[PDB]
C-alpha cells in the first residue's frame, strides 16, 4: 500500500547514524516534526520506523511476539545473559523465563525489600561527614546498585562476596561495547574480561545453589524454586544469566530517575516543600519509613511520574518486523525495524498540554494524563510492560525518603547546568551532575 516516510539524506553504509549520535532525543523529535506519527530512518543498513503518538504507539505494544521481536536488538547483550536465556532462547522459552520473574519483583517480597532498601541508605549516611559536595549520579548508581543486589540478588552478594562481585560486575559493563552493533565478534580484551567474568559468577551461582540447599526472599531463590511447564528446573547458567539481566535492566535506569526526582525538586522549591511536607507527615503519622512510602506518597508519586515523563531512561525501543505490520494506513515490511520513543511521545501537545513545563499535577486524579497507557510509556506497554515497575518506584520513592529525611540538599551548579545525556545508552543526568549536602 503506502509506505512510510523516508528520511532523505543519509550515509551509504552509515545511514542517519552520525545525525542520530549527535543528540538522539533532538533526531527523533525532528523526524516526527517533519514526518509525522509513523516515519522511517536508517541506522547502518537497517531501516527503522519511529511509531509516535498514542495510535502508533498503541500498534507497537499491542503487536504480538509473532509480529514484533524483542531478539535482535538485545545480541550485544547475549555474551553476558548467555547463550539461551531472554531474547536468545525462542518465543516460548523466553516469556516463560521472564514470567517467572515477574512474581519476584512485585507484592509480597516488597515489603521485605523495603527494611534492607532503608537499611542501605542509613547505613550510607551514617559513615559520610557532616556536610560535603558528591556526585549526586555517582551516589544513586552506588546506592541503587547495593539495595538492588541486596534485594534480588540475595544477601551474600553484599556481603561476602561483595568485592569479586562488584569487580565482575564492573568487567561485564564494560563488556557492554556500542562498537559491538558495527562490528559483531570483534575481538577485544574487554570482551575477554567480561566472559571470564561470566564464567565466575556462573561459578559462584552454583556455589550459593549448593549451600542454600544444604540451609531468604530474594528472586536468586525465586529461580531456584521455579519450574519449567515441564518439570524441568532451571540451570546454573539459565539463572546466573537471568538474575544479571535484572541488575542490569534496574540499576542505571533506577538511579538515574533518582538523580532527577532530587535534581528537580532541588529546582523547583515548590514541590521540593510539597514533598518534604508528605516525608514529615508520613514519618509522624507512621513512625520510621517502613512500608509508608508504599502508598500514601501520592506527591512524590506524582513527581516520580513526572520525571519519567521528562526524563525517560529508555528512548529508543527497538523491536524487528516479523510479518508485515500496519499502522496507520501505512504498511511496515518485514526486516525492517520499528521503535517506540517515550521521549518524543512524552513531548506531544495533544497527549500533553504545555509538554516542556514540569508539573506534577498533571497526574491528578482530576487531570488524568497518565490514562492513555500508549501516551505516558516511560515503563513500556504491553506483553512486555516493565516486570520492575514497582520495584524500581519503591526504590526511587525510599531512596528519595530517607535522604531527604536525613539531609538537606543544595544544587552545587546553576539550575538550568542540569541536562540529560542522551549519548549514554542509558539515558542519566549529565556528567558533572554535584550536589552539596548538610546534615538535619
Ligand atoms: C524507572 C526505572 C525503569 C524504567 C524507566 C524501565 C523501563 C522499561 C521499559 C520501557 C521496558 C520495555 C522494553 C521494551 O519495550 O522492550 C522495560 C522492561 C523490563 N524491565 Fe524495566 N524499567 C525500569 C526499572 C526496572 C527495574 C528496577 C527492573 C528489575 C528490578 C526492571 C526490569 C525489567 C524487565 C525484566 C523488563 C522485560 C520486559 C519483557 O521484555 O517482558 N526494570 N523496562
Ligand atoms: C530482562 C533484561 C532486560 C534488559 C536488561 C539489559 C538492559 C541494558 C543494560 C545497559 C547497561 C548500560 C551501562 C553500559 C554502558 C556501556 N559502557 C560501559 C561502555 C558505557
Not at 559468577?201 to 524454586?225: G, K, P
Not at 532451571?234 to 533506577?254: Q, V, Y
Not at 495533544?350 to 516542556?356: A, G, Q, V
Amino acid at each position: 500500500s503506502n509506505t512510510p516516510p523516508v528520511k532523505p539524506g543519509g550515509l551509504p553504509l552509515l545511514g542517519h547514524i552520525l545525525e542520530f549520535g549527535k543528540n538522539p532525543h533532538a533526531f527523533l523529535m525532528a523526524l516526527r516534526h517533519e514526518f509525522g506519527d509513523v516515519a522511517e530512518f536508517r541506522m547502518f543498513h537497517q531501516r527503522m520506523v519511529l511509531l509516535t503518538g498514542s495510535q502508533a504507539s498503541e500498534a507497537f505494544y499491542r503487536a504480538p511476539d509473532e509480529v514484533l521481536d524483542q531478539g535482535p536488538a538485545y545480541r550485544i547483550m547475549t555474551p553476558i545473559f548467555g547463550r539461551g536465556v531472554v531474547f536468545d532462547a525462542r518465543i516460548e522459552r523466553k516469556n516463560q523465563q521472564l514470567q517467572m520473574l515477574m512474581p519476584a519483583l512485585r507484592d509480597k517480597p516488597m515489603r521485605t525489600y523495603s527494611e534492607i532498601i532503608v537499611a542501605e541508605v542509613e547505613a550510607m549516611l551514617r559513615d559520610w561527614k557532616d556536610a560535603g559536595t558528591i556526585d549526586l549520579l555517582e551516589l544513586t548508581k552506588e546506592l541503587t546498585i547495593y539495595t538492588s543486589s541486596h534485594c534480588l540478588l540475595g544477601a551474600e552478594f553484599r556481603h561476602e562476596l561483595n568485592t569479586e562481585f562488584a569487580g565482575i560486575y564492573r568487567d561485564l559493563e564494560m563488556g557492554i561495547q556500542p562498537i559491538a552493533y558495527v562490528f559483531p565478534n570483534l575481538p577485544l580484551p574487554v570482551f575477554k574480561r567480561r566472559d571470564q567474568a561470566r564464567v565466575r559468577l556462573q561459578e559462584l551461582v552454583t556455589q550459593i545453589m549448593e549451600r542454600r540447599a544444604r540451609s531468604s526472599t530474594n528472586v536468586f531463590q525465586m529461580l531456584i524454586d521455579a519450574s519449567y511447564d515441564d518439570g524441568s528446573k532451571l540451570t546454573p547458567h539459565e539463572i546466573t544469566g537471568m538474575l544479571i539481566a535484572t541488575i542490569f535492566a534496574g540499576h542505571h535506569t533506577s538511579s538515574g530517575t533518582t538523580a532527577w526526582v532530587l535534581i528537580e525538586l532541588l529546582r523547583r522549591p515548590e514541590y521540593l516543600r510539597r514533598v518534604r511536607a508528605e516525608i514529615d507527615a508520613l514519618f509522624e503519622t507512621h513512625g520510621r519509613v517502613t512500608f509508608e512510602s508504599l502508598r500514601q506518597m501520592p506527591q512524590l508519586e506524582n513527581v516520580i511520574k513526572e520525571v519519567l515523563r521528562l526524563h525517560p531512561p529508555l528512548i529508543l525501543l527497538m523491536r524487528k518486523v516479523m510479518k508485515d505490520f500496519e499502522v496507520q494506513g501505512m504498511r511496515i515490511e518485514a526486516g525492517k525495524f520499528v521503535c517506540a520513543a517515550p521521549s518524543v511521545t512524552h513531548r506531544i501537545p495533544e497527549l500533553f498540554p504545555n509538554p516542556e513545563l514540569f508539573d506534577p499535577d498533571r497526574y491528578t486524579p482530576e487531570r488524568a494524563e497518565d490514562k492513555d497507557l500508549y501516551g505516558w510509556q516511560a515503563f513500556g506497554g504491553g506483553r512486555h510492560k516493565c516486570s520492575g515497575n514497582a520495584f524500581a518506584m519503591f526504590q526511587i520513592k525510599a531512596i528519595v525518603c530517607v535522604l531527604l529525611r536525613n539531609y538537606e540538599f543544595e544544587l552545587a551548579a546553576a539550575p538550568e547546568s542540569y541536562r540529560d545525556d542522551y549519548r549514554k545508552m542509558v539515558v542519566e543526568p549529565a556528567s558533572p551532575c554535584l550536589i552539596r549536602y548538610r546534615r538535619r
